[model samples]
Target: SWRDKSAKVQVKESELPSSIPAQTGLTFNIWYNKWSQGFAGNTRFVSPFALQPQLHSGKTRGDNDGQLFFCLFFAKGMCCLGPKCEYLHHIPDEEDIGKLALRTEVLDCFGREKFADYREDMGGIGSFRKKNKTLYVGGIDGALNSKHLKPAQIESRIRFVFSRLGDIDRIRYVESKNCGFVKFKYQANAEFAKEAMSNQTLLLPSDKEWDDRREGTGLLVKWAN
Candidate 1:
């Protein structure tokens, strides 16, 4: 019965469902574009940002013109992708559009300012600039007495492997000690690794119940204001 209904609906794309059977009775129709929105260095999706409304019939007063609705999905450390436009037709209601634009701008400004504060609090970018050249990776679970390798040894091995890949400016354990961060001389090389190394597996040497293997993928989220 479900399949039959679906087939009927497909055959009558322009027609209202038999359950309703009339367009005049229809109050509202909502459609989504099914596209993703995000800003630079953001690792999460934002929702309920813009709602476009259509009031159709004929161009008589406010009868034919469409309307718009906007929602500011608030979260700490989030950002919005933007570049304002005054395009008409499908997108209606300039006032609603303006509200969304202003909201996005405000949120993005706060996020950038907060991120700069974080960077400054954490020893600034200048401190990370060291002359020592080494490719660094981390031992997240701590290097205990394992027959496979020690933490230092594991770090060395990772360096050796990645060195063959490209020139590494330096590798150092993360501030947290559990994880680590890597830096490359050239931005392109670092970008390459950032893209390619994600979702790969790294093997560890261990003689225990737990296997010494982990995924390389990591979160790079930018918290918002």
Candidate 2:
């Protein structure tokens, strides 16, 4: 019966059952996140084991299990949106761990073996896709001028540090702005250096007596637009 804004039901002790029926033969439905495939919905849960292994990473399709191998972009610390990414964002399950060994034979953007377990906090495969050959470096100390270190020395220092990552096409330094742009011979090299040199300090050679003062603050690095 309805009472005011609420409805109430009443039953006698005799009408009520002595014991509640146990939940039996309950079926649990599984659901997979559809947003993982860059969509905004979910689908009926299909066990990963039930799906056939896929050669590339992407959305799950009919009868095709997504990704037998670890995502190469994720291993290099470069993946796009997490939930929206087409690739698996985390390490594969135990069943796929053995597949990682096969990836080591492949080469990554850095010209090194592509290990599946490798990961980085910043950048991902998406960053490498930028095809950026220039890197913007900042946070050089104005004190370099006071120390009588010439612009050439600073440029040389920048070149030396970044050259280790890959072949350099050119390096342009603006002493007035305390910044510089380094162009790599290849985009992959720039991508590797950007991740590697982030938050790193550079020590420039000084004509004066060598001292810790020659060390500059940690450089701010990113791919130039």
Candidate 3:
């Protein structure tokens, strides 16, 4: 009997039942009819939930939409399948268009200032003369040894630490060398990471023995060159 009225209107996704078929046409009609009865011709009934508003203003929400800089995947010259990727792939050519785009400028993970211009330089935006995109990271402890950890696990640790500086294209680890090379999507990202990671202790999840061993010694970071 209730199925007769179900053909008239479709239920919205937000109003659909989660697990089972709890709602029927009868229930939907009763709820809407009862609510509608409370309102007169000039006045309409408003659900209490309608009064609530989003936390951010329209402009604020627009500003917070996507990655504020280059997409990590795109920066590495990797192919983005399309809109499915989380980061922004293309940089607008027009200066005004770029200004209004979601990601307007380039910034490091630490929120340090980088070049605002998108043009290419022989080296980069900074004082560095070499325009290398690869960084050599040395002084790695044995905690990352493949014997103790899986390849994914080792790579995850390295990414978790280095990704903070910027988007990484790829990480190359040498088991025999006990060191790795971190390549960034952009030269600027590599430069920032090189400076930040230099003279700094390498970060590991929770390996106490490895942590203690490398305590005083800092990782060697510079252009792979």
Candidate 4:
């Protein structure tokens, strides 16, 4: 009731330009030393998708699939519309991926077709026939586990680390096996996370209790069937 617009609302219409204005090309700000020690900066990305919000290149949920989808160019920092872009300008948050994902799997989001079967390494293009946004994480054997850091805490830790990369749908862990599965909402984020996280040990901040005592976990992240 509070937000609904009526004749009395007097909503001011945005100034629509008669001609297309000069596009604001790629723009971003990156610190020379983004890589701090293990204490912080677990993630690398700094700039967001929309760089030029003043242009008003965005739209109001145009009520169609095309209007409601993610702007791939933005991920590459190419979108100039910022808040006004026709396509989605924000990060691929959890809310939109799941809804649009169902309709966009074969072609909507981005690049290449899937292979009929997964590669031996399970690290290449996923099945072209179907889209699977799940990542298979292995080598949990070295993860923090014990009275101080119980299995539940381990799950929370896993979620915290993975969620930092992208918005996930859900996650599952195996007590008998040293493995876990992260169900993400988008394939683009999943692929990149696979590259950035594999063979890396995500150290827990704080004292000895947080950090894994054993050697690096060296996680093996890959696409799941």
Q: Relative to the unseen true structure, what is the C-alpha lDDT of residue 47 in candidate 4, on a scale of 0 to 100?
A: 23
lDDT of 1 by residue, 13-130 (tens): 2222223221111221111111222222333222222111122101211122331221111111011211111111122233433543455421211112111232334544322321
The window of 10 residues in a row where model 1 has the poorest summed lDDT is 70-79
Ranking by TM-score: 4, 2, 3, 1
In model 2, what is the error at residue 106, expressed in angstroms? Answer: 16
**What does the lDDT read for residue 115 in candidate 4?**
38
Best by the lDDT measure: 4
lDDT of 3: 0.44
> Which stretch of 10 consecutive residues in model 3 shows the poorest summed lDDT?
48-57
Off by over 4 Å in 1: 1-148, 174-176, 204-225
Off by over 4 Å in 2: 1-129, 142-147, 204-216
TM-score of 2: 0.40
Tens digits of lDDT, candidate 3, 91-157: 2123313443334234442123443334446544554323457888875553232235555666677
When 1 and 3 are scored with lDDT, the better candidate is: 3
Taken over the whole model, the C-alpha lDDT of each candidate is 0.29, 0.45, 0.44, 0.48
* lDDT, residue 65, model 2: 44
RMSD list, candidates in order: 19.0, 23.4, 21.9, 11.8
- List the candidates ranked by lDDT, beginning with the highest: 4, 2, 3, 1
Best by TM-score: 4
